[PDB]
Amino acid sequence: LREKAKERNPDEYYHAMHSRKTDAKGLLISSRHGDEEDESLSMDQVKLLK
Amino acid sequence: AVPSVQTFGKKKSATAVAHVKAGKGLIKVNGSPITLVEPEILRFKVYEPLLLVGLDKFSNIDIRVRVTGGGHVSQVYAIRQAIAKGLVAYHQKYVDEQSKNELKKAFTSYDRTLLIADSRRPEPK
Amino acid sequence: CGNFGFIGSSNGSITIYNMQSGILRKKYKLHKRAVTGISLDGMNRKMVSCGLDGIVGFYDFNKSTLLGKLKLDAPITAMVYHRSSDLFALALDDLSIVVIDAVTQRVVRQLWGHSNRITAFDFSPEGRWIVSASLDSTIRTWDLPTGGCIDGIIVDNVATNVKFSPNGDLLATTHVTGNGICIWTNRAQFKTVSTRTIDELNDIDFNTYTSLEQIDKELLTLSIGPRSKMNTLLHLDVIRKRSKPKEAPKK
Amino acid sequence: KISDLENKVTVSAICRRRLPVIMHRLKMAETIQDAVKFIEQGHVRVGPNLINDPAYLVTRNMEDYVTWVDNSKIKKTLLRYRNQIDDFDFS
Amino acid sequence: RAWDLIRYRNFRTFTGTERIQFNCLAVDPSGEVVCAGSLDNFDIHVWSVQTGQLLDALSGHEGPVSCLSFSQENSVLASASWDKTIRIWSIFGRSQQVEPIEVYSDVLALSMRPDGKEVAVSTLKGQISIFNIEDAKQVGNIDCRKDIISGRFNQDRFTAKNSERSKFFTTIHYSFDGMAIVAGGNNNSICLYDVPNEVLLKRFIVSRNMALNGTLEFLNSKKMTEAGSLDLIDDAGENSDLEDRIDNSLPGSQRGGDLSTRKMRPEVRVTSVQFSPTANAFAAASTEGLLIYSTNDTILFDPFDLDVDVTPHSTVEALREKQFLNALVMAFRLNEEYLINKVYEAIPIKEIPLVASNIPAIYLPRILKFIGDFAIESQHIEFNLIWIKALLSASGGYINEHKYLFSTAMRSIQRFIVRVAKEVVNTTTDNKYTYRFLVSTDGSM
Amino acid sequence: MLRRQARERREYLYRKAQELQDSQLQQKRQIIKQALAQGKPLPKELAEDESLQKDFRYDQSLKQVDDEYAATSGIMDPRIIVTTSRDPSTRLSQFAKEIKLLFPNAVRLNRGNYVMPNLVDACKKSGTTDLVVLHEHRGVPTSLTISHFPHGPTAQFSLHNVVMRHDIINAGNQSEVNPHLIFDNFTTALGKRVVCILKHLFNAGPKKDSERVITFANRGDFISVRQHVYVRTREGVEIAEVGPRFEMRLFELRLGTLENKDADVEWQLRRFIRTANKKDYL
RNA sequence: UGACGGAGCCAGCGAGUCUAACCUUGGCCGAGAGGUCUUGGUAAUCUUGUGAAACUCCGUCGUGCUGGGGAUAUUCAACGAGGAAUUCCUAGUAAGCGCAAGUCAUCAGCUUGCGUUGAUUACGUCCCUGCCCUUUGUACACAC
RNA sequence: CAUUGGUGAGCAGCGAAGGAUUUGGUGGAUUACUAGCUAAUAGCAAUCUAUUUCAAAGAAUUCAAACUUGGGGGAAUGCCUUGUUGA
RNA sequence: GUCGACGUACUUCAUAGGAUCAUUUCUAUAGGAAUCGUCACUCUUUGACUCUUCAAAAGAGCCACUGAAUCCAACUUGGUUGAU
């Protein structure tokens, strides 16, 4: 892993770096809910659940 | 949704991220205001991006700076660099290019280390 | 530069806006009656304003100072700034055209002859002439080097607008009647016209000086011809030996 | 070995030296068709000057300078993915 | 390699030790040392010219050395490279001193003031930054990427507004009074600025040929069909004979040789700009040729503090009344070429030095540059040399303490002395000596 | 030049892996070369492969300093930095002075607040070739590390019987002429590797009458380093001792610069193995 | 440039199921091994992450050195920035400051890292002390 | 306590018989404007035909023509060139 | 410390029976099986076509006229005797 960090090549574009994002310290945010769900649900969904 | 701009200011190991967006005029370093930045003798080193160009540039935008690393004087140099080049980048992107390069001319006439750090060193003689 | 636009109001105040972002940058308050002409240098360094109180103000533009103020003898109706030669012309109310340079702030020509109000005027693109048009149904051309009137046209409709092309190709006039734009071509783009005054040293009237053959009999003087004739004469053997082809042609 | 001058010299080797294949091996695009689309859209410069056609052959010393143009949206989104985007130098 | 322009011989050839290809050079003023930089080596190669050896390899750039220039006065080397850095090397005399100035983006085309005080670099952002050399801090920059005409190519699928192909200058050059910069790049605009005010003086469209590629910013939408543009269709097999039905263009070739071997239209670009050292012009190496742009004083009435009593009529009355100095300064305030020529020829030889001593100092570069551009082709050789002798004797200390004002008016004068007058003097000298031989010696048998 | 040097080291170790992988074809091509030379029959494995012989038609025209030093051996003079550990004592500063006087084309760099990554980067883009980092123990210098910079090797030594020229007497000034070298019984391949490392930091081609000499004499993995001047008499040759003497022992030799310690080790001192003290250049 | 007494604050290294005292006083259980509880003394760069110190601020003092047996409920060892000489040193450098680690050699009577704060003076010269090089210009013009 | 995150509920402000977003089609520009057709010194354009035919001119031993082939090896039968036998 | 002889030890090398395919019929064998001018239906495989996801990127650009779709406001209708 240290060698891969030495050979990152910073001109590395993927299409998944639109959806995936990064916290303040620089590490990877992994959403602990789903990735087939949504974490925030809409107002009418909240109306039905409540 | 808002016009916003992010810049970076660095000295030795301090680093400061400044987000500038349109607002009411509040300048906040690490959550606290800019008028609390210790060691209090370099508070004018932090202030000179404001006093070099006037507060009427800052009357319509709000800046926030997050400063990690470094020491006291490296953190005030990171703060002033982040504020200066953040004001320049905001006036580039969302105000006119004439005020952009007027700001660049004023900061570069004071010291261009507000905008470009001295980064990679030494010299092997 | 395209960055700045200048507005001159009827209460005598110049406001300077940015053309990109549309906001007020500066605001000069010199005149008290209506500002009828604003212009600026080709280097964005000195601006010149003229109001119908008859003062031409000269401001520095980068610094916001004024460089001076010159009081003319009539209210000024229109300014045209020739920007390469830094000479601007004013149509005064006393039916004269005052040509004044912005560098040293002097009246340098004053053209008289119009009988009614000057509707329009414009500089030549080389800045040698100024063509004006006025309510006496006339269009005049002034050679401001010599300061006199070169040509005059009595045209039946009053010409309300006169503009030169930014090359020396065309004059465009605009009259009181007629929905179009009348277009003229200057014949002095193909020939040379005499700057000799109309009313109602031929080389100096045609702006030439044919250089005389020798200035003094005790002065050495080369030939009137190409300079290379001496070298061709002195080395025409080796030049032709150079110029031969590398092998003999097949006859 | 000099048997490379008969065996290993090959249209596929000259084709692996083309600009989208260099790109895809440098991880600069996820596939060769994506690399073709990006350098057709005018995102990729070698050295200072923008390269616009796919067939451009990139030698060994000249593949150190294959980058994106500045003010690229792709450069902006990789910098903002790692939120190292500094808007002072436009990206 | 070095070329004698007398005997037409390549007398010197300098190679390195590493087999690299050189992209820019810079010579000493006192031409002991040549210097050259590559785009694949990151070093600068320093050769002596007297001996042939490799004197030094300067190292310290971490990017390909794009441009080199020696300061013409104090002889300090300035290199600038794609690691976003201009660097100043004190080579001569025990220093081995290096001063690196960082800059915002990667540099292509550094240029150097005629007095060696400042250096102007062009960057890939689109800017021209100007730095003080001795105190390594930026004096001022021009933001040039919005007054650049970048056309749209035929093959590319992105507009000329959003293109990043040519919105920067790959070649810049100072004027010889140090006050202006001409600049060109891979675009069809060349722009010149005045560096005190950092404002565009004038922009020149270098081509309107639609046969070149990057000329039109907006392409005719009639030519864009349901499959491709109609100008990328090769109609080369509709040709009357084989030698232009032939396609021998190997595929991914850009900037090789032999225009048949590239398959695209030739793009429009300026590769080098330079100002003229003697007369108020510049040359630009475009794709169409060496475009030479020059002013001339025959047109453009541009006076210098005339008043209402300053007139061609007034000037010839002062000439007829033989106030010769007043006629000369009236013609200078008119700044009219025919009037200056008329007064200049009407002043007699008896009082050239009185007039030339009483010329005011603001009209000195005007009379010097007039005498230069007149005397190159005028026949009055002794008259022009009398005027030059009177001006250099009467006011030749003002010239020496204001070098860069008369730096292009004095180079135009010694373009007249060594190029027509010295050739004539050589001919009369050879005639004198052949006479002395042919009559002084013994021809008997 | 970051990307160029990274990909250049990548291509070099790719070529080295490809050489050790396809080095069997070199020796079996050698077998069929000498089979053509003396007309002796060829083995079954080299007799039934048809592709190797029709490559041998092409390959019949095929045919000291090693891979890191081979490109610029005698072409270019070295350039050495000598630096101490960090916050050094005065006797280590005297020793670093003595080592920078030992090696010609060496300068000395003050050490304090220099991180070793950006120190290595500053050296290998300012164009230096070797770095000598010296470590002490209460004055007594205990180690020196030599790093050859265009991704070359680092040899780490300990120093053992150190007597210093500053410590002895005012015997005068040094010579600083390009010396002659002496290497005594460096016999193994590690011995030739250490010789090439230790001697490509001297200038190529001294004078034939250059009157100072410096010897690296191996005595059971303890390289005695002495430096002598001489003047040849009528009966022998008279040796005077000048400059420092020590014994260096190689304990590590790896294949990268100083900064990483992720480099592949070519050799390092197995101390606690069962047969440790039984062989030399172990 | 101090001494007390509070307060604000700012790092970068470092993550092996691995990291860590000693000597006693006694009670109870047990066949014994021992277990568990209890107890005083000595030693200590603590223990894995949070945190540094120099620094900054706020109250208070007020600048002429050290000894044991004698004597009541004074006087007999060193030392207040270190002589002659001597060594090293040119920018994130000298120096101040703390914090971690402990990597097959070396080191814990310490060694190596890591950040924090950060200058003065040279940046010329061969005059002195030395060391080196050359003494046909060769290499192609021009010039010397 | 931050969201410089999503979804909503609302104010102030802006605010002329409404506002916003998205999209299909057509027309005009995207180079500098001398008119359509044909068998063209003129006809036609409502039509070329029942004059559209004759005459003249007009034919290189160039009776030569792949400047057009991915590399190595070969070419039974072809094909090319040269000679040859028989007519 | 070098190469020969002897001795020792080690490595490698066999290639036979039968079937099938390979000749625009026929691989040499009679022990084998195939010669038909389309009508429809079902199931299956594939490729385009349009739209789209991972998942973006770039828009041959401007202006006018005309049609459409959606979200608000406004009006109308149904609606707590019950809308969603």
Considering only CA atoms, which residue is closest to the C1' of nucleotide G132?
F177
Compute φ and ψ for E436, nearest 5 degrees. Answer: -60, -35
Structure method: cryo-EM
E311/C146 CB distance under 8 A: yes
Q: Which of B4, B8, B107 to mutate to test the interface with D (most CBs of D within 10 A)?
A: B8
Joined together, the tokens standing for residue B108 give: 């570069």
d(CA F172, CA F151): 39
Amino acid letter, residue E307: D
Looking at residue C87, its amino acid is L
Q: Mutation target for D interface from F2, F14, F58, F60: give the one with most D CBs within 10 A.
A: F58
* Token code pair at residue E351: 């009082």
What is the rounded CA–CA span in Å between residue D60 and residue D62?
A: 5
Nucleotide closest in space to F269 (CA vs C1'): G104
Contacts of D2 in chain F (CB under 8 A): 58-59, 61-62
Buried b (16+ CB within 10 A) or exposed e, C93-105: eebbbbbbbbeeb
Give the DSSP letter string of E327-352: HHHHHHHHT-HHHHHHHHHHS-GGGH
* Residues of chain F positioned with their CB less than 8 A from the CB of B71: none
Q: Residue A31 corresponds to which tokens in the numbers above?
A: 């959403």
What sign has the CA pseudo-torsion F254, F257, F260, F262? negative
Q: Which residues touch strand I (CB under 7 A)?
A: A 15-16, 18-20; D 30, 34, 37-38, 41-43, 72-74, 77; E 152, 154, 157-162, 217-221, 223-224, 229, 231; F 44
Q: Please, what is the end-to-end C-alpha distance for chain C in angstroms? A: 67
CB atoms within 10 A of CB C164: 20
**Domain of residue B92, CATH code:** 3.30.230.10
Contact call for residues C20 and C31 (beta carbons, < 8 A): no
Contact B27, B47 (CB under 8 A): no
Separation CA C119–CA C136 (nearest Å): 10
Q: Which of F169, F220, F209, F198 is nearest to F99 (CA)?
A: F198
Question: DSSP code of A22?
Answer: B
Q: How many whole angstroms separate alpha carbon D15 and alpha carbon C124?
A: 61
Closest CA to E167 of E108, E223, E111: E108
Measured distance CA(F176)–CA(F188) in Å, rounded? 31
What gap in Å lies between CA C55 and CA C72, rounded to an integer? 6
Measured CA to CA, the distance from residue E187 to residue E171 in angstroms comes to 11
Give the residue from E380, E421, E8, E424 showing the smallest Cα distance to C234.
E424
Task: Measure in Å the smallest separation between the Cα of B44 and chain D Cα atoms.
Answer: 23
- Pair E180, E193: CB distance under 8 Å: yes
What is the 8-class DSSP label of residue E419? I
Give one DSSP letter per residue of F21-40, joined into a string.
Answer: HTTHHHHHHHHHHHHHHTT-
Question: For the residues of E96-163, what is the DSSP string, one character each?
Answer: -EEEEEE-SS-EEEEEE-TTSSEEEEEESSSEEEEEESSS-SEEEEEE-TTS---PPPSS--S-TTT-
- Spatial CB neighbours of E287, under 8 Å, sequence gap ≥ 6: E207, E212, E266, E267, E268, E269
- Set of chain A residues whose Cβ sits within 8 Å of the Cβ of D29: 13
Q: Specify the resolution in Å.
A: 3.2
Given the structure tokens 């080193």, which residue do they identify? B45
Return the number of other C-beta atoms located less than 10 Å from residue E85's C-beta: 20
Instruction: Please tell me which of the candidates E302, E339, E381 has its beta carbon nearest to residue C220.
Output: E381
Q: Do F262 and A2 touch (CB under 8 A)?
A: yes
The interaxial angle of helices E364-375 and E381-394, nearest 10 deg, is 160
Cβ distance B89 to D83 less than 8 Å, yes or no, reads no
* Residue E321 burial by Cβ neighbours in a 10 Å radius (0-12, 13-18, 19+): exposed
**Which residue from E124, E155, E168 is facing D52, i.e. has the nearest CB?**
E155
Coil, strand or helix at B54: coil
Among E144, E143, E145, E108, CA closest to E123: E108
F85 and F134 in contact (C-beta within 8 Å)? yes
E264 is written with which tokens?
Answer: 């695209």
- Token pair for B47: 């202030």
- Measured to protein CB atoms, the chain H nucleotides within 7 Å are 1-2, 4-8, 29-31, 67-68
Task: Write out which nucleotides of chain G lie closer than 7 A to a protein Cβ.
Answer: 8-12, 52-57, 87-95, 97, 104-107, 109-118, 123-125, 129-133, 139-143
Cβ atoms < 10 Å from Cβ of C235: 12
Task: Give the separation between CA E108 and CA E185, rounded to whole angstroms.
Answer: 10
- How distant is the Cα of A13 from the closest Cα of chain D, in angstroms? 5
Pairing of strands C35-40, C46-51: antiparallel
SS3 assignment, position F183: strand
E239 touches strand H (CB under 7 A): no
* CA-to-CA separations, B50 to B54, B58, B83, B88, E354, in angstroms, rounded: 6, 8, 9, 12, 61
- The answer to whether A19 CB is within 7 Å of strand H is no
Report the distance separating Cα F282 and Cα F269, nearest Å.
7
β-pairing verdict for F180-184 and F80-84: unpaired
Q: Measured on CA atoms in the order A18, A24, A28, A29, is the torsion positive or negative?
A: negative
Asked if F258 and F85 touch (Cβ cutoff 8 Å), the reply is no
Residue type, F138: R
Instruction: State the Cα–Cα distance between residues C232 and F161, nearest whole angstrom.
Output: 87
DSSP state of E221: G
CB contact under 8 A, E59 and F2: no
Find the residue in D nearest to F11 (Cα).
Answer: D60
Q: After which residues is chain E broken (C to N over 2.5 A)?
A: none
Cβ contacts of F110 within 8 Å, gap of 6 or more: F83
Q: Give the number of other CB atoms < 10 A from CB of residue C18.
A: 18
Amino acid (1-letter code) at residue F127: G
* CA–CA gap between residue E292 and residue E282 (Å, rounded): 6
Q: Which domain holds residue B11?
A: 1-125
Indicate the angle between helix axes B72-93 and B43-51, nearest 10 degrees.
Answer: 10
Q: Which of E40, E158, E186 sits opposite D49 (nearest CB)?
A: E186
Residue of C nearest to B56 (CA): C25
Residue E393 sits at φ, ψ, to 5 deg, of -75, -40
Neighbours of E351 (CB within 10 A): 14
- Name the nt closest to E157 by C-alpha to C1': I58
Beta carbons within 8 Å of E31's beta carbon, 6+ residues apart: E49
How many angstroms away from the CA of D13 is the closest CA of chain A?
23
SS3 category, B10? strand
Residue E428 three-state SS: helix
Secondary structure E strands in D20-61: 44-46, 49-50
Among the listed residues E36, E42, B124, D27, the one whose alpha carbon sits nearest the alpha carbon of residue F8: E42
Q: Which residues pair with E34 in a beta bridge?
A: E27, E47
Residues 6+ apart with CB under 8 A from F6: A7
B30-36 contact pairs (CB < 8 A, 24+) = B30/B65, B30/B66, B30/B67
Give the closest of E104, E140, E143 to B116, CB-based.
E104
Angstrom distance (rounded) from CA B48 to CA F150: 44
Name the nucleotide nearest B75; use CA and C1'.
Answer: G10
* Cβ density class E142-151: b for 16+ within 10 Å, e for less: bbbbebbbbb
Chain Cα centroid distance, residue F26: 28
> Cα-flanking dihedrals φ and ψ of residue E143, to 5°?
-100, 105
A2 interaction partners in chain F (CB closer than 8 Å): 262
Q: Nearest-CA residue of chain F relative to A2?
A: F262
What are the DSSP calls for E7-60, one per residue? T--EEE----SS---EEEEEE-SSSSEEEEEESSS--EEEEESSS-SEEEEE--
- Residue identified by tokens 């300079």 is C227
Contacts A14 to D, Cβ<8 Å: 30
C-alpha to C-alpha distance for B107 and B83, rounded to whole angstroms? 11
**How many structural domains comprise chain B?**
1
Sheet holding E273-275, edge to edge: E273-275, E281-285, E290-294
Query: Where does chain C have alpha helices with state H?
Result: 202-205, 229-234, 236-243
Q: How far apart are CA B12 and CA E435, in angstroms?
A: 83
Q: How far is B90 from chain D (nearest CA, A)?
A: 8
CB count within 10 Å of CB F44 equals: 8
Among the partner-chain residues B120, B121, B125, the one whose CB lies closest to the CB of F107 is B125
B105 vs E98, E104, E140: nearest CB: E140
The helix/strand/coil state of E88 is: strand
Chain B contact set for D91 (CB, 8 A): none
Q: Tell me the helices (H) and strands (E) count for chain B, helix number first.
A: 3, 5
Amino acid letter for position B122? P
CB C98 within 8 A of CB C90: yes
Residues E213-250 as b/e (b if ≥16 CB within 10 A, e otherwise) read bbbbeebeeeeeeeeeeebeeeeeeeeeeeeeeeeeee
**Distance from C-alpha of F244 to C-alpha of A18, rounded to nearest angstrom:** 63
CA distance linking residue E53 with residue E166, whole number of Å: 39
